[PDB]
Amino acid sequence: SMIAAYQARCQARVDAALDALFVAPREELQRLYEAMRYSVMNGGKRVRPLLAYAACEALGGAPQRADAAACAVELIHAYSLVHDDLPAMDDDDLRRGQPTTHRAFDEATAILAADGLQALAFEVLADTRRNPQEHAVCLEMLTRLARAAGSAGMVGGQAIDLGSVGVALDQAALEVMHRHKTGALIEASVRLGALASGRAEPASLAALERYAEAIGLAFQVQDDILDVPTYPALLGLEAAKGYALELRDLALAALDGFPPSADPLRQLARYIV
Amino acid sequence: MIAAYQARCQARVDAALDALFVAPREELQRLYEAMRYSVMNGGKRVRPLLAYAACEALGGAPQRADAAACAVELIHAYSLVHDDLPAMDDDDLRRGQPTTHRAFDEATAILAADGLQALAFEVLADTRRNPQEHAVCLEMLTRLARAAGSAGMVGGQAIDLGSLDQAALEVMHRHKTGALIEASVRLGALASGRAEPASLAALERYAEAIGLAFQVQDDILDVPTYPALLGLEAAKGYALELRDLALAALDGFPPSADPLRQLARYIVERR
Ligand SMILES: CC(C)=CCC/C(C)=C/COP(=O)(O)OP(=O)(O)O
Ligand SMILES: CC(C)=CCC/C(C)=C/COP(=O)(O)OP(=O)(O)O
Ligand SMILES: [Mg+2]
Ligand SMILES: [Mg+2]
Ligand SMILES: [Mg+2]
Ligand SMILES: [Mg+2]
Ligand SMILES: [Mg+2]
């Protein structure tokens, strides 16, 4: 509704900023840059940039302050999907009905494009012209994204995912995996946007992290539900729907006491489920 | 002398690196072991030596460059894991030991190295591990991101795989190894707290020169190579010319720059 409009603005905005990053500095690197562009500019919904923009606004910041954050999270997200698709992992020919990067190009070029996307994510955050926050904040943003994207976060999640094959997984184990594999980067999108506001404080950061923890799981539960070891398989379908709504509630609760500028986050929570 | 310097820089950076590979939980133990296996492999740590030496050339205590030294070796290590993969060079061995994708598996190697890249940036942005002025930490991060990315190292690898005359070979080398050798030098100089534009420019000239000298000398020792393009004797001549340009860039630097001068000589004096 309003969240639909909010999403569309966030998407337009981050796409414009992203599209500008893919000019090869010289002719020999053209194909690499085209693969980088192919990997990012794929019509994705940009939830992570929406979360950075919305967390910035929830704390009273003008959203353009989060522009760099919004690019950096989507850069990390994009590189992850390129690697996930590779023959050594999920070996997928298609993502959302289009050829994956390694299929469109080749496997080496895909690995390289995504490796470049990761470096570019950090480069954008450290660039004080693109990310004009106080220097201490730029460094906290970098620290946070590096931890979230690395072996103790997202990459670790993917390892947990690949080490759980054939192993019988219970709910607690499935959630550990989700918290790493997708939770860490969702929490970082929120944290980074909040930092970009220039008004972050420990209490408001802690609340927004509770919000992010809840919605990050809600996305996964709801995906499983729409697809019908999954949440519906563990709990049954009706109980899985119940858990989704419980997560929405914990998200709305974490936003207790926030101003009206936090409505986009409240709406997103409701929307997911 | 430069051998004793190299052994100290190696010991120092290995101690700092070794501390980074503790899995925060049991589900990640195998990933962290693959990470450790990929970095703690008895490598010579030239990039860390370069950071330590550039820091000392400008008068800085070398421990100031600890984070820089870790970050550049982290990026170096991740790059070699990816280069060894079946999609690229498909190598079973590196320096006679199984590669990461063989000791573990292909996915775990990809992932370990991805984690190494993130850890390199994490180490520089962490003001406790890299306790410089904030603006310096950001410049260090900027420099390393540009050098490690598609406009540097990764772009080099793309040029390499997509490949030839001397100018083209040098473009490839400048990207594939040059950018990170230059960044190691730059990062260590930044860490000194005493960097200035003129010094930074001189150190960059030094780095461009030695980055290429490594490659020329490797080709010579092996005998689209420097010997094949220039001739064998002309290639040896060029190696000395590069050492000289490196030493000339350091004109007017004090005696604390000797480790850098000795490294330049060492590169072309090898075997
Ligand atoms: C390479 C790395 C670090 C990947 C982790 C991040 C990620 C979002 C994986 C996709 O999961 P999936 O394979 O379950 O989802 P999809 O169905 O989208 O492929
Ligand atoms: C972004 C990536 C993966 C970069 C690779 C960088 C690099 C130094 C590769 C080694 O080159 P090589 O294959 O010529 O030498 P070696 O003989 O050591 O494999
Ligand atoms: Mg997968
Ligand atoms: Mg997949
Ligand atoms: Mg699922
Ligand atoms: Mg190789
Ligand atoms: Mg190679």
CA dihedral A208→A212→A214→A217, nearest 10 degrees, is -170
Q: Rounded to whole angstroms, how far apart are CA atoms B262 and B271?
A: 16
Q: Rounded to whole angstroms, how far apart are CA atoms B261 and B256?
A: 10
- Residues 89 through 118 of chain B touching chain A, CB cutoff 8 Å: 105-108, 110-112, 114-115, 117-118
Asked whether A255 and A211 are in contact (CB, 8 A), the reply is yes
Asked whether B268 and B217 are in contact (CB, 8 A), the reply is yes
Whose tokens are 């709990």? That residue is A235
- A198: which DSSP letter? T
Asked whether B77 and B46 are in contact (CB, 8 A), the reply is no
The residue whose CA has the least distance to atom 4 of ligand 2 is B79
Tokens in use for B204? 């960059």
Q: Rounded to whole angstroms, how far apart are CA atoms A218 and A88?
A: 29
Backbone discontinuities in chain A, residue before each (C to N > 2.5 A): 228
Closest ligand by atom to A234 CA: 5
Ligand 1 atom closest to Cα of residue A157: 5
Q: Which of A272, A246, A273 is nearest to A47 (CA)?
A: A272
Q: Rounded to whole angstroms, how far apart are CA atoms B266 and B256?
A: 17
Question: Do B31 and A155 lie within an 8 Å CB cutoff?
Answer: yes
A237 is in an annotated binding site: no
Radius of gyration of chain A from Cα atoms?
Answer: 18
Distance (Å) of CA A123 to CA A68, A145, A185, B143, B250: 10, 12, 17, 8, 30
Q: Rounded to whole angstroms, how far apart are CA atoms A54 and A269?
A: 12
- Calculate how close chain A gets to B139, using CA atoms only, in Å: 8
Q: Please, how many CA atoms are within 13 Å of residue A45, restricted to the half-sphere of its CB?
A: 11
- Beta bridge pairs of residue B93: B98
Exposed (0-12), middle (13-18) or buried (19+): which is B42, by Cβ within 10 Å?
Answer: exposed
Exposed (0-12), middle (13-18) or buried (19+): which is B92, by Cβ within 10 Å?
Answer: exposed
Buried b (16+ CB within 10 A) or exposed e, B141-166: bbbbbbbbbbbbbbbbbbbbbeeeee
Asked whether A97 and B116 are in contact (CB, 8 A), the reply is no
The three-class DSSP label of residue A94 is: strand
Task: Using the Cα atoms of residue B226, residue B229, residue B231 and residue B233 in order, give the sign of their dihedral.
Answer: negative
- Amino acid, single-letter form, for residue B261: R
Minimum CA–CA partner of A26 in chain B: B151
Q: Which residues surround ligand 4, an ion (CB under 5 A)?
A: A 84, 90
Instruction: List all residues 6 or more positions away from A68 whose beta carbon is below 8 Å from its beta carbon.
Output: A124, A125, A127, A130, A131, A196
φ, ψ at A266 (rounded to 5°): -65, -40
Q: Rounded to whole angstroms, how far apart are CA atoms B24 and B30?
A: 12
CA–chain centroid gap for A6, Å, is 17
φ, ψ at A168 (rounded to 5°): -70, 120
DSSP for chain B?
-HHHHHHHHHHHHHHHHHTT---SSGGGHHHHHHHHHHH-S----HHHHHHHHHHHHTT--GGGGHHHHHHHHHHHHHHHHHHHSTTTT--SEETTEE-HHHHS-HHHHHHHHHHHHHHHHHHHH-TTTS-S-HHHHHHHHHHHHHHHSTTTHHHHHHHHHH---HHHHHHHHIIIIIHHHHHHHHHHHHHTT---HHHHHHHHHHHHHHHHHHHHHHHHHH---HHHHH-HHHHHHHHHHHHHHHHHHTTT--GGGHHHHHHHHHHHH--
Asked whether A37 and A178 are in contact (CB, 8 A), the reply is no
Whose tokens are 């496997």? That residue is A107
Instruction: List all residues 6 or more positions away from A130 whose beta carbon is below 8 Å from its beta carbon.
Output: A67, A68, A71, A124
- Beta bridge pairs of residue B94: B97
Q: Name the binding residues of B for Mg(2+).
A: 83, 89, 91, 93, 215, 219
Question: Do A160 and B27 lie within an 8 Å CB cutoff?
Answer: yes
Ligand 1 atom closest to Cα of residue A83: 1
Resolution in A: 1.9
Q: Rounded to whole angstroms, how far apart are CA atoms B179 and A87?
A: 30
Exposed (0-12), middle (13-18) or buried (19+): which is A54, by Cβ within 10 Å?
Answer: buried
DSSP for A132-154?
-S-HHHHHHHHHHHHHHHSTTTH
Show the beta-strand stretches assigned E in A73-137. 94-95, 98-99
Q: Is B45 left (phi over 0), alpha (psi -120 to 50) or beta?
A: left
The three-class DSSP label of residue A193 is: helix
- Residues 31 through 90 of chain B touching chain A, CB cutoff 8 Å: 31-32, 35, 82, 85, 87-88
- H or E element that contains A200: none
CA–chain centroid gap for A248, Å, is 18
Nearest to B150 among A29, A126, A143 (CB): A29
Q: Rounded to whole angstroms, how far apart are CA atoms A173 and A178?
A: 9
Asked whether A31 and B161 are in contact (CB, 8 A), the reply is no
Minimum CA–CA partner of B143 in chain A: A123
Distance (Å) of CA A72 to CA A46, A110, B35, B104, B159: 12, 19, 24, 30, 25
Question: Do A119 and B150 lie within an 8 Å CB cutoff?
Answer: yes
The three-class DSSP label of residue A99 is: strand
CATH of domain B1-271: 1.10.600.10
- Ligand 1 — pocket residues by CB below 6 A? A 80, 83-84, 90, 154-155, 157-158, 181-182; B 114
Asked whether B249 and B205 are in contact (CB, 8 A), the reply is yes
The residue whose CA has the least distance to atom 12 of ligand 1 is A84
* Other residues' Cβ atoms within 10 Å of the Cβ of residue A182: 22
Q: Which of A208, A217, A203, A268 is nearest to A247 (CA)?
A: A217
Q: Rounded to whole angstroms, how far apart are CA atoms B41 and B38?
A: 7
The three-class DSSP label of residue A115 is: helix
The residue whose CA has the least distance to atom 5 of ligand 1 is A158
- A169: which DSSP letter? P
Asked whether A138 and A128 are in contact (CB, 8 A), the reply is yes
CA–chain centroid gap for B122, Å, is 18
Residues in chain B: 271
φ, ψ at A177 (rounded to 5°): -65, -50
Minimum CA–CA partner of A128 in chain B: B138
Name the residue ranges covered by the structural domains of chain A: 1-273
Asked whether B238 and B212 are in contact (CB, 8 A), the reply is no
The three-class DSSP label of residue A95 is: strand
Architecture of domain A1-273: Orthogonal Bundle (1.10)
First and final C-alpha spacing in chain B: 17
Minimum CA–CA partner of B33 in chain A: A151
Q: Which of A21, A109, A115 to mutate to test the interface with B (most CBs of B within 10 A)?
A: A115
Asked whether B154 and A112 are in contact (CB, 8 A), the reply is yes
Instruction: List all residues 6 or more positions away from B226 whose beta carbon is below 8 Å from its beta carbon.
Output: B169, B215, B216, B219, B220, B235, B238
